[PDB]
């Protein structure tokens, strides 16, 4: 051993259909501007 | 009336070409549904993307752009109408010449575009939209820098694949002052974009901490709405994914007393993610591993491995296993985490788990074995107690089943753990 447990990301903060879809919570790709 | 809005836009005339532009407008910024594809259908996408020309006069590159913008707001078919047109060149071009009332729409379009597609977002930024965008941010108008940081955002948005990062790691200077904002929407844009950015290899990171990020991040996991917690935390999470001096910026700007805050979270991504933080600190070096027990942040995480939900409950599984690897160096650290109780969460976590886990626990598990049979001969004695920990705790049995494991790496553990101290 010795090996590494470092995780990045996507390897890890582990994993959910909705969890993904939720805290896809992000601020949202388009906006329309209005009056 | 759009056959008569069509014919007005054609005209030689500039104040009916104006008129007629308002009119589009008006209509792509109603309240309920923009007839988007009817205005693609009379073909003046071509039109309005000529009125966004140099020699245009300002109201009528406003006026068109703001429409070229909501068409651009929809679906990917119809902001592909606006790329296709060659719109966005257009857009890069005002982000200099324009008034801030321009330079503000301009830079909602193409954050629109951006926004769409990692094709489109790289589009944007080999036609160098980087310069002019920055240039963006000298101004002090709130709602120009607000807007600009968004579309910024969107641009460092993707991983499949990653944008260029020759590009986007030019904005890293920017996004530095910008988390110092005092504009909660400017704020929360700003640590999305450092989230993303701080997500990659050694360099990216490094990126990340030379322009002193870390410390504000830091600061800003305190911050009242989980808006701004859940960004800035999932940047701080991203960069204890690096090498242990890397990690040590993080410590060193005090992320450990924070994150002892955050495992309360209502939140639960907050929580995981702190867990998940955690152990990649936990990962780190022993005296890492040793501060982590310092901030006293072992007994909330032995509490979230025993009643957590599934998913924190994995993360606080690798806090622990991963602090328990230090333990070959000291044996305090063992004797710690066995005085805390975390034998019998790791236990009961070896039925439920899926492999990955179940091979971790076991690491665990050995690790804490490991040092109670040193714990024997270093002063003479007859068992080794934190087999006993186990046993009592029921771990034996669930490690002895283990061995009916599929998996070959699985089964090896958990046998020769069986085997050596059972």
């Known amino acids: 051993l010795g090996s590494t447990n470092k995780r990045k990301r996507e390897q890890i903060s582990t994993d959910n259909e909705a969890k993904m879809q939720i805290q896809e919570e992000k601020s949202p790709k388009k906006k329309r501007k209005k009056r | ?422």
């Open chain 2, 1 to 422: 009336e759009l056959p008569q809005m069509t014919q007005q836009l054609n005209s030689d005339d500039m104040q009916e070409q104006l008129s007629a532009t308002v009119k589009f407008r008006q209509i792509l910024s109603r309240e309920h549904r923009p007839p988007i594809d009817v205005v693609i259908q009379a073909g003046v996408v071509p039109r309005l993307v000529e009125f966004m020309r140099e020699n245009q006069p300002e109201m009528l590159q406003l006026e068109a752009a703001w429409a070229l913008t909501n068409i651009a707001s929809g679906t990917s078919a119809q902001t592909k109408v606006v790329v296709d047109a060659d719109a966005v060149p257009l857009f890069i071009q005002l982000l200099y010449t324009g008034s801030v009332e321009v330079k503000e729409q301009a830079i909602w379009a193409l954050g629109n575009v951006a926004g769409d597609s990692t094709d489109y977002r790289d589009y944007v930024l080999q036609c160098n939209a980087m310069e002019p965008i920055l240039g963006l941010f000298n101004s002090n108008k709130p709602s120009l820098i607000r807007t600009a940081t968004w579309t910024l955002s969107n641009l460092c948005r993707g991983k499949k694949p990653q944008p260029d990062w020759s590009v986007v790691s030019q904005a890293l200077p920017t996004l530095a002052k910008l988390i110092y904002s005092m504009d909660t929407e400017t704020l929360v844009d700003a640590c999305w974009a450092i989230s993303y950015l701080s997500d990659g290899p050694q360099e990216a990171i490094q990126a990340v901490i030379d322009v002193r990020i870390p410390k504000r991040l830091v600061e800003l996991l305190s911050h009242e709405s989980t808006l701004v917690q859940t960004p800035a935390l999932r940047a701080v999470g991203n960069i204890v994914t690096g090498n242990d001096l890397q990690t040590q910026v993080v410590i060193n700007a005090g992320v450990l007393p924070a994150l002892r805050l955050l495992l309360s979270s209502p939140k639960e991504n907050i929580k995981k993610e702190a867990c998940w933080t955690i152990s990649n600190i936990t990962a780190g070096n022993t005296e890492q591993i040793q501060a982590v027990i310092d901030a006293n942040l072992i007994p909330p995480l032995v509490k979230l491995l025993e009643v957590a939900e599934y998913k924190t409950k994995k993360e606080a599984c690798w806090a622990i296993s991963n602090a328990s690897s230090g333990g070959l160096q000291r044996p305090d650290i063992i004797r710690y985490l066995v005085s805390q109780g975390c034998i019998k969460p790791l236990c009961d976590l070896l039925e439920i788990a899926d492999n990955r886990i179940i091979e971790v626990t076991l690491d665990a598990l050995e690790n804490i074995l490991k040092m109670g049979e040193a714990d024997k001969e270093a002063r003479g004695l007859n068992i080794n107690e934190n087999a006993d920990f186990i046993e009592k705790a029921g771990g034996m049995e669930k490690i002895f089943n283990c061995q009916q494991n599929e998996n070959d790496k699985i089964y090896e553990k958990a046998y020769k753990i069986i085997e050596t101290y059972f």
